[PDB]
Amino acid sequence: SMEQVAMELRLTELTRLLRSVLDQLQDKDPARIFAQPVSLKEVPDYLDHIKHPMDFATMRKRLEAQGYKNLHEFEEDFDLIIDNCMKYNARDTVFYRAAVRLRDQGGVVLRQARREVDSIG
């Protein structure tokens, strides 16, 4: 139908916007701590602690499959990256501190993204 196609155009546009957001958020992780899944080979107990792992590469895979229907779904995954890290790692670690910095700097990006998704529709 024409309606289906119009919807898919919207989804494609959202994906375009979220691709820009994702690039901006990942730039706030210059250490690349969150670039890839936590290695279950190197951290074999990880899933005993963290029930829903997340990382930027996994987000990008879902993104390019147009798997984020709205900004809320995308933000949920971003929050998983940060929250998983701040639970597994103690406050005095480079990992926890990188997550705090990513959270703080990312808030600015996400605040304007929400306005853009709302504005453009």
Q: Which residues bind ligand 8UJ (CB under 6 A)?
A: 33, 38, 43, 85, 88-89, 95
The residue (of 29 and 110) whose beta carbon lies closer to ligand 8UJ is 29
As measured in angstroms, the least distance from the Cβ of 92 to ligand 8UJ is 13
Amino acid found at 45 = D
| Residue 21: CB atoms within 10 Å | 23
> CA gyration radius for the chain?
16
CB-based contact 53:46 (threshold 8 Å): yes
Give the DSSP letter of residue 93: S
Residue 27 beta carbon to ligand 8UJ: minimum distance, rounded to whole angstroms: 16
| Nearest to ligand 8UJ of 78, 88 (CB atom) | 88
